[model samples]
Target: PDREKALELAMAQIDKNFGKGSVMRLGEEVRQPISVIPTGSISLDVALGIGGLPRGRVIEIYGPESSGKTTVALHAVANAQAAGGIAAFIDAEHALDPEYAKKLGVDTDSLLVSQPDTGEQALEIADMLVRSGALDIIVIDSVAALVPRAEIEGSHVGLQARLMSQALRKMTGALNNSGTTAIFINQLTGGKALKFYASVRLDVRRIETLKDGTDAVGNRTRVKVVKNKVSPPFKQAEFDILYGQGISREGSLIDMGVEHGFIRKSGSWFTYEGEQLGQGKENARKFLLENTDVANEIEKKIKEKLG
Candidate 1:
């Protein structure tokens, strides 16, 4: 009885000192499960293992120019909106085309667009929006484009990196329990702080230029999860990004199917469910695109295999 009284008193004192519920037994501690936002590409989502980007975490998508970095972010925005959540885009580069975004299935009317004049302003706006707890996702386009006022006027060596570190530190705190997923589009150039702070760092690159009889139709881009805190890292996914049409969903599904031997490829002829899908690869892709049900079944099977 004496020992029990001492334990109860110690627990009460700790709770009083640190505020209620702060001093709980380890078994009594409760943690919020991490939620996910689908990235719009099935293969990429499967590669991520958690189905998509984890909410309330910093994700970095960095790559060279024309590597489909912006496209991937836009897809996530569209997906977020489709899931009945608000999405915002901070266009530091001032290059987000609304018409193109609309074409990609993003609801332009609902999307919050901000073109910040300074890097500090961008971070501040993001912090404020995140703390509001109203948004579901925020995409800051191209971290390299964030120009500090000091750098615009006079030479300010390493100021951008310092600002990024501070902003990321504060943003990480704000993101906790806020349920807003932040995606920062970065370039191949700068951003050491970004790499360090990002929970998931995806490196994208154009692996193949897809052509349609003398005209380039799209690019087969490879996305490598360089760092992932929610799942196993180094998982890679490849999908076609059509020049003006965004990601080719059917095309990616077909590729993924073929890769996993779900869709058999004998020379140039493709077969699915023991039926020929015509001669050329494009023919098979076209068949899958037209036959949504077939494509859906294939996707389910491929995702099952991935699991």
Candidate 2:
């Protein structure tokens, strides 16, 4: 504590004599030239502000059990590789699915997977991967279960939240330093849970289904983007979880597509030619764009991508 030279000497040692790498700027993130940013799911990305999930920022996905939390995460993993970038997943609770990730079109060979049992482990793995400068996107499957059971309730939970938020900021710095994309998945026990860490918070709920002849029973779980700060608010959209079946030559997640033939009359998102976009969405502009015409914008992007 008394020797100022101790700190200076350490820096000088690191810079000149110890573990010197070809690149001297250890603090900098690796720069990547990305052509196209894959929207997690074409539809889900449209639900986000930029017609795709935000690049270079942390996004929290929260919803009840079976509410498409993991599904969306897998979807994003698929997207990262399609963009020709390596995808890294640090499963804090060790609850990730390679099968699911594969079905989503993730480059299984290129995926960097980490299984961490505790919050400390999560932080450690994330730091290592980010520092390695190997991956393009990093996803933290959760922060809730990382907290001790004794501290999971009441105000005590805030401690876990605070730590996780701090970790996210650190990872964000690392990713920004690396110029990569990061998506963090958090769960929603209730609506309040959505308030925790959502740039775009969605509430996925099971809506009632009306049955008739020659029509299938039930539809995909509906989602609502309850809170979105980055983009203009949008009407809801409907989607069915694509169960990976061998219907296609490639075993892929299949979209049942939009739930149709059902009576949708309440305040819905779909327009005159259609019904609502889906539930729990803040923006569907990209999906709309994909379906409709945006000549100049599309052509400009094509040119840029080719370049």
Candidate 3:
């Protein structure tokens, strides 16, 4: 309390001399909570341990091809806009699609997409936008495709290994200080190593594909938390990505209902307390909605697993 009084008096004298135009007390700054972006999947959010991806830090999502890397990044972008903030996508590979992003719940009209020529250039653009305080979230699609400026149109080998790492380190402060959540989609190949300063790291891999007849309907991915400095680490969960539908835990939620005796299935004809839940996958989903108690039970389980 005495130190506080001394500091206040010193501030008063400075303000009297300088007319109080450009000074602020440390405690006078506005503050927000740590984590903000919700991926729209309860179970996956549970595994993340913070209820969502954190803001004001760097996040690395790296894994194999077709592992839903861009899909998950778009999910975060949707959540950012849901919270009333603008988002940007730095597509170094030039693969982002507006129609595809829309199905993932992203507001394409509210998103800014950039196609940077080199990996170094992508990081530079992201850093400048972050410092400008315009974007609330930004996604860098697949660091594997990010070629260093020096390596572009020339015969340069392994220069990205050092160049990319330096770029990430240089921008790390801007990311943290700017209060923007930067999601970096990286890969395990190209002989490149994971950079050191990311606050969270997740590895997403395609486990199985859900098919309807000869066409693909959906896919299952195993999201393992490789590193989480903001919350618990080593937690894992699975998510289903539907073609044109957003990521869902519905399949698991229904399975949990069956295991807990809230739902019964005999020859694919599901029943809940003697009420026939029709036949096939559609009817089962219908029954799930019919039972409010079961839905609440699934939510309870999701929270339990998160804890």
True lDDT of residue 26, candidate 1: 31
**Span of ten consecutive residues with least summed lDDT in model 3:** 21-30
Candidate 3 TM-score to native: 0.76
lDDT of 3 by residue, 85-203 (tens): 88988887887778988877788987888898887788788788888887889988877787777656774465777766776677777868777988988776322434466777888
Q: Estimate the TM-score of every prediction.
A: 0.86, 0.57, 0.76
Q: Give the candidate number with the greatest TM-score.
A: 1
Weakest ten-residue segment in model 1 by summed lDDT: 25-34
Candidate 2, superposed: residue stretches over 4 Å from native:
1-36, 148-158, 189-198, 206-219, 245-307
The residue pairs in collision within model 1 are: none
Q: Write the per-residue lDDT of candidate 2 for residues 208-269, one digit (tens) a residue.
A: 44233535333355656655544544434555443441011110111212132222324544
Model 3: colliding residue pairs: none
Candidate 3 error regions (>4 Å): 1-34, 155-158, 189-194, 212-214, 255-283, 286-307
The lDDT of each candidate is 0.83, 0.52, 0.73
lDDT of 3 at 133: 85
